[PDB]
Structure 1
Amino acid sequence: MHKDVKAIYEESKILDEATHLYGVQRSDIHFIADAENYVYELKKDGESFILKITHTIRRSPDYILGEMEWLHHLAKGGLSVAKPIASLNGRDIEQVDDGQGGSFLLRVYEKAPGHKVEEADWNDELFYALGQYTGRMHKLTKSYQLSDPRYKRQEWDEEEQLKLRKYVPADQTLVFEQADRLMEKLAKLPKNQDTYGLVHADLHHGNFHWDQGKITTFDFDDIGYNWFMNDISILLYNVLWYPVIPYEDKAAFAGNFMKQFLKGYREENELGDEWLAYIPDFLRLRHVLIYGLLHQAFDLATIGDEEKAMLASFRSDIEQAAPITTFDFTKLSQ
C-alpha cells in the first residue's frame, strides 16, 4: 500500500464501518492483502465475498464506478463474473470519511466459485473454453454504454506503466526510442465498435476459476479501453510466462494455444483475421509495459541480483525489438 494511505489507515475503525455497511461480523473478515488495495475475505450465510479498500489519494470513486458499471452490464448479459455486491444502502461503492478530507472506498465482490485450474485440466479443451468465454465477454462489451464521461476508464495509451520516462533512468535512450516507435505504430491501428472497447486488459489463467466445468472470472481492478486482439495477446503473454504445465517449444505452444482459443472465440465473437498480424506487436507492448511496471515498483538501488538480471534481459529484448515468439499467427486465419 502507498505510504500516504498507510499513514491514515486505522484498520479496526474502517472494518467496523464495513460491518455496519455490509452486515458481516469482524470474526468473518479475514485479511488477505495490502498491495494496491487492502483486501479481505468475508463470510456470510455460508457464502464468500471479497472486500477491497482503497483511498481517494490513489483512486477516485468516479473511476472505480466505471468498473462497477461494466461488471453489472456483463452480469446482466449472462456472463459469469464475480460481480459487485450492493451494501445495505444499495451501493456498489461505500465512501468512509477518513476525518481529514479524504475517503476510503469500500467495495465487495462475490468470491468466484470453484478453484484454479490444476494440471490435469491444462489442455486443448481448457484453451477452447477460455476462448469461448473471452468471445462472449467481447461480444457483451460491444453493447456496454457509458452512462456519463465522469466514469470513463483509461485508453490503452494512458496506462501509467507505459510512461517509461517517468520511471526508467533517463540514459536508456534506445529503450525509449524502441518503446516510442512501437507506440506510434499501434496508434495507427483502427479503433471501432468491432475492434476496440472496454476490456479486462490484464488476463491471466489465474483470473479464471472453474467450478465443475463452469468458468467465472474475477479481479477487474485495471479494466480499460483496448483492442480485442490485445486483450487476447495479453492472456497469451501471461500464459507464456506462467503456464500451468511447462512447455519446451515456445512457438509451437503459442500457436497451438491460439489455435484452440480462437476456435472457441470464433463461436462467440466475430473479429477480423487482419488482427492476427498484430499479435507479435501486442506481445512486444506487454513486454514494454512490464519493464515500466518493474521500474515503478522497484527501488533500483535496493534490488537483488535476480531482479537486476531480469531487468537487463528485458532491456536487451526491448532495445533489440526481440520477438516474444516467432510463430506466424496469420496461419490461423479462418
Structure 2
Amino acid sequence: MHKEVKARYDEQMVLKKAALLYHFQPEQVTFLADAENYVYEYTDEKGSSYILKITHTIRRSSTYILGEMDWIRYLSQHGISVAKPVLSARGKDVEAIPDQAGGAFLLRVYEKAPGRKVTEADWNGQLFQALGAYTGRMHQTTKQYQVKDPRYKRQEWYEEEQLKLETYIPSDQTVVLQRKDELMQKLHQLRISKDVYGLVHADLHHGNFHYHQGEIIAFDFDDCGYHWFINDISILLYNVLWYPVIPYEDKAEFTGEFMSHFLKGYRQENELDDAWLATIPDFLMLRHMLIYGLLHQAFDLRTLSADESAMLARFRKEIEDKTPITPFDFHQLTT
C-alpha cells in the first residue's frame, strides 16, 4: 500500500461512511487484501455480496477510474468474461468520501466473479494455453476500442507512477537510475501501431482472475493502460515466474513450458510476430524496475526491517548487474 495513502486511511471511519452509500453493516464486512487498494467483500440489505475497492486521490482520480470502467464494459459487450462494475445507491460508478486532510477516499464496487483461484490441479499447459487464448482475444478486441473523450483516457506505459524511480529511491542510486533511463530510451525505439500496441490489462496474474468451469474471468483492471501487446504478455510471465502455484524444478525450463503453451493459445486469437519475442527480457527487466519503485512507494525507508532491506538490496543488485529475470534463451521460441 502506498505509504502516503496508509497515512490517511482510517478503516473504521471510512467503512462507517461507506456503509451508507452501499447499504451494508460495517461490522460484517470481510477484509480481503491491502496491496494497492483496500479490498473487501460486503453484503447489502438484500443479502447480495459484492467486492468493494477503496483507494485515495493520492494515487487515483475519479476520472481515471471511469476510464477503466469504460474499457471493462466494452470488453464485456464483446464477449470477454470480466467482473463488471456495480453502481452505488446514488447510481454512481465511483463514490468519493471526503478526507479532512485533503482530497478523497474513492470507492467502487464490482460483481464477485464466480469460480475460484487456480489450484495445483489447474497449473499445467491447459491453463497456460487458456491464458494465451484469453489474452489474445483481449488484444484482438482492444484494437477496435475508441476513446471519444480524452479526459477519460488511460495512461501510456511510460507515464506509470511506479517507474518514476528518481522520486522514490534515494538519488545516490545513480546506477539504478541509469539502468532504468537506458532501458526506457531503448523501449521508446519500438514501433507502435494498432496491431502491436493498445489498451491492455497490464497486470495479468493468478491473483487477478478466477477459473470458472475451466474458463478465465479477469478482474483488477486498475492498472490498465496503453502498452505493447508483448509487454502485457511479459508481465504475466514475470508474475508466474515470481509466484508459481507449484514450485518449478528449473526456471529456464518452466519459462519455455509456460511460453510454448501460452503462445499456442495466443496465436489462435491474435497475431504475434516472432520479432517481438526477443524483447521479452527487456520488458521483464522493466517490470523488475517497476516493482522496485512500488516497494519504495510502500515502505518507510527510515524503519526498514532486516527482510525489507534484504529484498531491496536483492532487486538493486539484480538491476545494477543486469541479471536477466529468467535464464531462458527466448530465441528458442522463434520460427
Is the TM value for this pair above 0.5? yes
Q: Aligned in 2, Cα 1:100/1:137: closer, same or farther, shift over 3 Å?
A: same
Residue 247 of structure 1 deviates from its aligned partner by 0.8
Distance 1:307 1:96 in 2: 33
* 1:182-201 pair list within 5 angstroms: 182-201=183-202
Aligned residues: 331
Asked if the contact 2:162–2:291 (Cα under 8 Å) also holds between the matched residues in 1, the reply is yes
Q: Aligned in 2, Cα 1:53/1:139: closer, same or farther, shift over 3 Å?
A: same
* 1:170-185 pair list within 5 angstroms: 170-185=171-186
Asked if the contact 2:15–2:26 (Cα under 8 Å) also holds between the matched residues in 1, the reply is no
Distance 2:162 2:228 in 1: 17
- Local SS of the residue matching 1:302: coil
Residue 269 of structure 1 deviates from its aligned partner by 1.1
Q: Which moved more, 1:295-304 or 1:264-273?
A: 295-304
* 1:116-155 pair list within 5 angstroms: 116-155=117-156
Asked if the contact 2:8–2:101 (Cα under 8 Å) also holds between the matched residues in 1, the reply is no
Alignment-derived partner of residue 321 in structure 1: 322
Alignment-derived partner of residue 277 in structure 1: 278
Distance 2:240 2:101 in 1: 44
Residue 205 of structure 1 deviates from its aligned partner by 1.8
Alignment-derived partner of residue 37 in structure 1: 37
Asked if the contact 1:128–1:262 (Cα under 8 Å) also holds between the matched residues in 2, the reply is yes
TM-score by length of structure 1 reads 0.91
Distance 2:27 2:295 in 1: 36
Q: Aligned in 2, Cα 1:70/1:29: closer, same or farther, shift over 3 Å?
A: same
Distance 1:59 1:80 in 2: 25
Distance 2:274 2:201 in 1: 21
Distance 1:174 1:140 in 2: 40
Alignment-derived partner of residue 6 in structure 1: 9
Residue 288 of structure 1 deviates from its aligned partner by 1.1
Distance 2:140 2:48 in 1: 30
Aligned letter for 1:38? Y
Q: Which moved more, 1:8-17 or 1:177-186?
A: 8-17
* 1:79-158 pair list within 5 angstroms: 79-96=80-97, 102-158=103-159
Task: Specify every segment of 5 or more residues in structure 2 that has no aligned partner in the other structure, as ranges.
Answer: none
Q: Which moved more, 1:209-218 or 1:68-77?
A: 209-218
Q: Aligned in 2, Cα 1:310/1:57: closer, same or farther, shift over 3 Å?
A: closer
Aligned letter for 2:14? E
Q: Aligned in 2, Cα 1:240/1:37: closer, same or farther, shift over 3 Å?
A: closer
Residue 100 of structure 1 deviates from its aligned partner by 8.2
Q: Aligned in 2, Cα 1:126/1:100: closer, same or farther, shift over 3 Å?
A: closer
Q: CA RMSD in A?
A: 2.3
